[PDB]
Design a protein around this ligand. Sequence first.
Ligand SMILES: OC[C@@]1(O)OC[C@@H](O)[C@@H](O)[C@@H]1O
Ligand SMILES: OC[C@@]1(O)OC[C@@H](O)[C@@H](O)[C@@H]1O
Ligand SMILES: OC[C@@]1(O)OC[C@@H](O)[C@@H](O)[C@@H]1O
Ligand SMILES: OC[C@@]1(O)OC[C@@H](O)[C@@H](O)[C@@H]1O
Ligand SMILES: OC[C@@]1(O)OC[C@@H](O)[C@@H](O)[C@@H]1O
Ligand SMILES: OC[C@@]1(O)OC[C@@H](O)[C@@H](O)[C@@H]1O
Lengths: 91, 91, 91
Amino acid sequence: MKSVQTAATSWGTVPSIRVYTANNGKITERCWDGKGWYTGAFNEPGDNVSVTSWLVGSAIHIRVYASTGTTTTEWCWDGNGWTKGAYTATN
Amino acid sequence: MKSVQTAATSWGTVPSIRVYTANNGKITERCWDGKGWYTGAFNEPGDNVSVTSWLVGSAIHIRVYASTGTTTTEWCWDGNGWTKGAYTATN
Amino acid sequence: MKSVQTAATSWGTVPSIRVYTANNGKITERCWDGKGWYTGAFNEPGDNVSVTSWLVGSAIHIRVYASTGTTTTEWCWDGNGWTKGAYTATN
Ligand SMILES: OC[C@@]1(O)OC[C@@H](O)[C@@H](O)[C@@H]1O
Ligand SMILES: OC[C@@]1(O)OC[C@@H](O)[C@@H](O)[C@@H]1O
Ligand SMILES: OC[C@@]1(O)OC[C@@H](O)[C@@H](O)[C@@H]1O
Ligand SMILES: OC[C@@]1(O)OC[C@@H](O)[C@@H](O)[C@@H]1O
Ligand SMILES: OC[C@@]1(O)OC[C@@H](O)[C@@H](O)[C@@H]1O
Ligand SMILES: OC[C@@]1(O)OC[C@@H](O)[C@@H](O)[C@@H]1O
């Protein structure tokens, strides 16, 4: 019995938390902004996940690294929707 | 599981570091505060681990996400003990 | 199928990002500082990887925890080359 795999990030002092879970090839996102957990907009394929985030002033930026096989895809949140990032592995 | 699985967080400029290792279904904690590595109070079940933390002043707040199977348990350090948090993977 | 396993850290407001990938027993590093992804100096054996980093002023310090079997090795970046750290899982 394998286990799901998670990645977590947080920012500010409320704080906001985002937890990403890779489960059966699908990565989903749960969100905390101080008043209960809810399901976020991130939904992308992957068996492995890592995450980092940074603030510019008050604006959060999130990068999620989703891996299937040997291919890692980066996904970007910059305040107005998830988009694919430029990340590639060694060529 | 071939190898153990780790997660790490750090805070301040000394820094303090906490490293969580999932090994044989148990997660344990090693701590650095600038003066040598020692074993921390965290000990909970899990095959997978992730962590995030934030400061309020000089006071650290840690959240560890411990997963076994498809069950992810959030553990909260807010200065005095590890308490089960409100996190669920789905409302 | 099995997939590679990653860990990510970031700092500053550009930001700089480092992504560590464990692939078939080797951990390598990809780097972003605003101007394209490139291959970093980090290269160490391991089947699992986690990372944390902290700034002291504008100087970044990175700790990478590489695991093979039950043995976790800490690798330290402090501005001038990767060195093995004092981390042990026991004692
Ligand atoms: O406010 C919720 C939300 O917009 O926060 C930023 C990202 O985590 C999004 O996926 C998420 O749906
Ligand atoms: O704004 C998108 C982006 O430029 O952000 C920094 C890195 O995450 C890049 O790979 C990514 O394409
Ligand atoms: O000083 C050690 C300690 O109290 O630091 C905060 C948490 O990491 C605890 O598990 C840990 O025992
Ligand atoms: O104080 C505990 C708590 O409220 O902290 C913020 C989140 O980690 C919650 O899931 C958790 O229950
Ligand atoms: O500029 C790239 C670099 O020096 O940045 C700090 C560390 O990530 C190093 O491994 C890496 O080669
Ligand atoms: O400067 C290296 C070092 O002292 O930094 C703090 C911890 O990462 C230690 O394990 C490590 O040896």
